[PDB]
Amino acid sequence: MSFSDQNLIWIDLEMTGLDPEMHKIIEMATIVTDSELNILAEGPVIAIHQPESELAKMDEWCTTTHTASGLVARVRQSQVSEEEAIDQTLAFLKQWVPEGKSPICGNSIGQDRRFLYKHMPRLEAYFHYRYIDVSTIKELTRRWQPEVLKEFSKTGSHLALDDIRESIAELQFYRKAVFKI
Ligand code: NA
């Protein structure tokens, strides 16, 4: 419909920890915006099944966070593997953005990209090599005019779709508050 090579692919992952070689993806969500950050479509929100032995690698922060959000129960119930999650996400993205054109967009998105390289390389390959990291702008704002940051707050629920929605809202806030373009 509004298929364009200027559209942006936003992605957030939840994981069993911080180390791609050790840990696993347990949730993925994607959103497509246009170049002006208008949300065009939300993609599959997928709790990815992992066996107990992988969930058992989670530290206290991960265990309490992902249990209290209901994600662990959804992971245990899920019948969707990483490959099926890739397939579903690619089938969605191909309707909105061409392959290789959108940077990866989100908060500290380098960490997510590391997990994509290791666990979902077919999905990583869909992104342009660049990064649109909203936390880059957060950090520069904290240093150049930190009082701006008191005007925006995040819930930070670690539900992947809600957090990527917050990432977009954060960048929308920055465009009005710290940008002049
Ligand atoms: Na994240």
Rg (CA), the chain: 16
117 is catalytic: no
Q: What is the resolution of this structure in A?
A: 1.8
**Furthest-apart CA atoms within the chain: distance in Å:** 50
CA distance 13 to 18: 11
Helices (H), ranges, the chain: 52-55, 60-68, 71-77, 82-93, 109-119, 121-124, 134-144, 160-177
Task: Look at residues 49, 51, 7 and name the one whose alpha carbon lies nearest to residue 30.
Answer: 7
CA of 151 from ligand 1 middle (Å) equals 21
In the block, tokens 């180390």 appear at 19
CA of 41 from ligand 1 middle (Å) equals 19
CA of 111 from ligand 1 middle (Å) equals 8
CA distance 107 to 137: 10
Query: Where are the chain's structural domains?
Result: 1-181
CB-based contact 11:30 (threshold 8 Å): yes
Domain 1-181 matching CATH 3.30.420.10: the answer reads: yes
